[PDB]
Amino acid sequence: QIKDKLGRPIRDLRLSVTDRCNFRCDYCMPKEVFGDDFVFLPKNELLTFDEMARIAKVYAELGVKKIRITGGEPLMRRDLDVLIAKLNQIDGIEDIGLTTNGLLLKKHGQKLYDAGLRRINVSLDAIDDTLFQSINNRNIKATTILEQIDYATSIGLNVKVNVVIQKGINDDQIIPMLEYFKDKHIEIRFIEFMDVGNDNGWDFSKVVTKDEMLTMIEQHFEIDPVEPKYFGEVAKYYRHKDNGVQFGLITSVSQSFCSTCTRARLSSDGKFYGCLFATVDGFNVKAFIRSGVTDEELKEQFKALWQIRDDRYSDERTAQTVANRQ
Amino acid sequence: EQIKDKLGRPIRDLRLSVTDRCNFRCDYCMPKEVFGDDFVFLPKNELLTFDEMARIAKVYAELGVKKIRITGGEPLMRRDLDVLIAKLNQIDGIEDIGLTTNGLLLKKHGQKLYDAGLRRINVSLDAIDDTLFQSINNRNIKATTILEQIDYATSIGLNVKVNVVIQKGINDDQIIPMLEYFKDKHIEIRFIEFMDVGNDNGWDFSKVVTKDEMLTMIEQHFEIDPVEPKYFGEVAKYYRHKDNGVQFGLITSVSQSFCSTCTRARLSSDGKFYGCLFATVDGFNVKAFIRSGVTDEELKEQFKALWQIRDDRYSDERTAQTVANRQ
Numbered sequence: 240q241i242k243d244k245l246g247r248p249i250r251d252l253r254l255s256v257t258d259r260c261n262f263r264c265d266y267c268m269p270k271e272v273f274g275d276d277f278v279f280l281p282k283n284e285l286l287t288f289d290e291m292a293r294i295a296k297v298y299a300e301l302g303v304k305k306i307r308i309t310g311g312e313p314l315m316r317r318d319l320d321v322l323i324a325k326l327n328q329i330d331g332i333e334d335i336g337l338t339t340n341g342l343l344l345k346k347h348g349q350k351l352y353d354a355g356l357r358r359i360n361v362s363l364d365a366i367d368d369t370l371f372q373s374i375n376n377r378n379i380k381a382t383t384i385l386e387q388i389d390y391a392t393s394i395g396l397n398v399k400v401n402v403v404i405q406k407g408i409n410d411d412q413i414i415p416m417l418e419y420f421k422d423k424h425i426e427i428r429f430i431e432f433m434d435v436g437n438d439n440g441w442d443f444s445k446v447v448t449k450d451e452m453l454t455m456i457e458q459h460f461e462i463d464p465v466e467p468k469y470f471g472e473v474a475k476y477y478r479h480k481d482n483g484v485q486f487g488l489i490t491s492v493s494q495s496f497c498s499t500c501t502r503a504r505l506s507s508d509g510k511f512y513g514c515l516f517a518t519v520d521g522f523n524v525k526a527f528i529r530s531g532v533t534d535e536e537l538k539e540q541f542k543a544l545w546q547i548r549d550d551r552y553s554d555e556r557t558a559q560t561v562a563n564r565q
Numbered sequence: 566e567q568i569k570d571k572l573g574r575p576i577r578d579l580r581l582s583v584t585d586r587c588n589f590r591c592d593y594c595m596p597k598e599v600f601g602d603d604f605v606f607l608p609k610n611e612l613l614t615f616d617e618m619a620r621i622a623k624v625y626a627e628l629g630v631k632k633i634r635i636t637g638g639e640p641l642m643r644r645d646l647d648v649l650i651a652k653l654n655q656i657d658g659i660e661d662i663g664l665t666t667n668g669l670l671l672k673k674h675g676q677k678l679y680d681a682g683l684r685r686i687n688v689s690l691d692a693i694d695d696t697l698f699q700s701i702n703n704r705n706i707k708a709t710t711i712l713e714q715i716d717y718a719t720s721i722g723l724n725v726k727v728n729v730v731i732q733k734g735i736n737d738d739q740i741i742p743m744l745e746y747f748k749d750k751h752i753e754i755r756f757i758e759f760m761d762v763g764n765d766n767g768w769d770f771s772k773v774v775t776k777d778e779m780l781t782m783i784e785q786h787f788e789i790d791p792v793e794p795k796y797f798g799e800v801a802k803y804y805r806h807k808d809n810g811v812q813f814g815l816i817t818s819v820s821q822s823f824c825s826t827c828t829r830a831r832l833s834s835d836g837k838f839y840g841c842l843f844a845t846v847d848g849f850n851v852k853a854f855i856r857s858g859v860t861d862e863e864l865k866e867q868f869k870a871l872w873q874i875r876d877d878r879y880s881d882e883r884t885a886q887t888v889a890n891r892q
């Protein structure tokens with residue numbers, strides 16, 4: 240069994256499938272930076288679906304059970320159903336999820352379902368249509384994505400919703416969004432906003448922690464804690480007492496979780512990373528694969544990359560924050 | 566003035582173990598089968614002296630230690646413990662000195678300790694029913710005796726908190742009676758998840774009651790709200806009674822391990838340094854180091870080196886092995 244320097248196994252391959260996106264969310268792909276001038280990866284500089292499938296097969300043999308399709312906005316990747324069909328035929332792979340702004344769900348949703356997609360995570364940072372647009376800078380209304388969510392649900396997809404909260408910006412959406420998704424029996428998850436400051440610890444200025452979110456929510460809702468489904472479950476779940484619909488809170492910053500992190504990551508340009516943060520360019524899997532290698536030489540290269548992994552960025556910021564309290 | 570270890574963690578707390586002796590034989594700590602008649606405890610001269618401890622505490626205060634916890638063993642068994650408290654009370658930079666005790670000897674020594682500057686104690690008490698408690702301590706001590714010690718300690722002006730380790734099948738039926746009793750005494754109680762490493766070798770949950778489960782038990786008898794953390798990376802998760810307002814704590818030693826904020830150095834009763842509560846091998850011989858003849862600077866430089874190479878994270882390792890054993 241394959242474990243890194245901190246004793247963590249490989250479970251979870253995050254597959255980035257494009258660098259492109261149809262939103263320009265102020266904190267992720269700001270319009271300044273990613274303007275009209277931006278040149279994105281060309282077609283041939285992305286991994287093919289066949290190379291993706293090959294990589295996934297090899298990872299399955301090392302322990303990976305789950306694959307999360309991301310980008311970018313994944314639905315801009317043109318024949319995404321084809322990847323999903325190939326991923327769904329890999330034996331050790333048990334779950335495939337997709338993480339999306341949901342805009343293209345009415346165009347590509349049925350195709351993806353028919354290829355074997357069953358679960359999606361839709362990010363939506365407000366339910367107000369105005370405030371959603373000022374976040375996304377592409378004149379989309381939240382109402383539009385709500386309708387996409389309803390379509391996805393109608394064709395049999397399981398939908399969960401991810402909201403990153405910022406304390407001058409998203410503060411006040413917490414209660415309306417719980418009410419709306421409570422009614423629709425859809426699991427929503429509030430996520431603490433991550434931002435490292437000058438002192439190299441966490442910056443709590445635009446943060447609303449799990450514990451303050453929870454003070455807000457109890458004032459408006461009657462609620463019970465749900466016991467962790469399995470050990471090391473990341474999200475802290477709660478249940479509305481009247482109808483048992485669940486929501487979750489993700490303690491990105493106030494309670495870092497690197498010790499249970501089993502996530503390996505392939506960028507859209509085809510480079511291996513052991514963590515969502517990372518200064519240097521990672522191993523060039525794309526280059527390696529295109530210069531003829533056996534499956535066995537691929538497996539051993541991924542094994543060696545994992546066994547050398549000691550990433551724990553969020554825990555490091557956590558420790559530095561303790562140090563800065565002085 | 567601020568020293569960090571290999572995982573970015575500053576030194577902040579010093580646990581000083583002052584004896585290996587104890588007046589109990591708690592089944593999960595000093596079982597009588599191991600610590601019975603033929604056990605040999607440390608000779609007196611192999612303990613650190615109080616001067617050695619004060620000198621060690623001083624140099625650690627220069628490296629950023631702010632809190633000292635006195636423990637053991639049962640620290641009240643150490644003769645003239647009040648002389649140690651008095652020397653530690655004279656050290657610049659130390660803001661808090663705490664004692665953790667089973668409490669049995671608090672009537673005997675409490676006033677002396679108070680006089681010497683002690684103001685805070687943490688009393689370990691795993692049950693409030695007498696028959697049960699006797700079955701745990703294995704020395705025929707009644708919980709009622711410990712309760713009277715607690716009430717004397719508060720009366721002389723010590724601040725008392727209570728710690729309770731819960732093992733499923735043994736004392737988990739005690740969570741409610743103890744919450745009720747100390748709620749009415751305005752004393753903060755804390756429940757701690759039992760740590761036990763299984764064969765395999767992540768955590769053994771076989772009795773383990775988790776913080777989550779403890780809370781499901783608790784919210785039925787009492788109406789409760791969270792208390793937000795007083796500071797960032799506070800280990801205990803606090804709650805308060807809506808009545809009233811008395812706080813209690815729950816400690817997720819096993820279900821939510823917290824090595825990332827761990828700022829604890831430890832000296833054993835035989836005077837060896839440990840960077841963690843769990844250790845399989847002997848630590849650096851601080852005791853022989855200082856008895857070999859060293860300067861305060863040489864001492865400080867060694868403590869700084871011991872901390873800079875520290876990478877312990879036992880509970881997180883166990884947590885990772887647990888995730889890894891799920892396959």
Ligand SMILES: C[S@@+](CC[C@H](N)C(=O)[O-])C[C@H]1O[C@@H](n2cnc3c(N)ncnc32)[C@H](O)[C@@H]1O
Pocket residue numbers: 260266267309310311312313338339340360361362401402403430431432433434491
């Ligand atoms: C990069 S998008 C990729 C998939 C798709 N475009 C989407 O947004 O659903 C994935 C997530 O990163 C999150 N994100 C970016 N920066 C973040 C930050 N500083 N703190 C918390 N989440 C962040 C966004 O909320 C988003 O849900």
Ligand SMILES: C[S@@+](CC[C@H](N)C(=O)[O-])C[C@H]1O[C@@H](n2cnc3c(N)ncnc32)[C@H](O)[C@@H]1O
Pocket residue numbers: 587593594636637638639640665666667687688689728730757758759760761
């Ligand atoms: C070594 S005693 C020293 C102080 C004093 N003799 C007392 O018992 O309070 C310190 C603590 O270690 C704790 N402890 C020992 N083994 C434990 C375990 N497996 N899980 C949780 N706590 C444990 C005991 O409950 C006790 O409170």
Ligand code: SF4
Pocket residue numbers: 260261262263264267268310311312340362
């Ligand atoms: S939609 Fe997703 S990838 Fe695009 S700018 Fe927003 S968070 Fe970023």
Ligand code: SF4
Pocket residue numbers: 496497500501502513514515516550551552553554
């Ligand atoms: S910051 Fe920690 S939990 Fe997040 S991807 Fe990196 S190692 Fe994993």
Ligand code: SF4
Pocket residue numbers: 587588589590591594595637638639667689
């Ligand atoms: S009283 Fe404290 S040191 Fe003594 S056996 Fe019990 S837990 Fe251990």
Ligand code: SF4
Pocket residue numbers: 823824827828829840841842843877878879880881
């Ligand atoms: S197990 Fe972790 S939290 Fe506990 S003393 Fe060791 S390093 Fe610190």
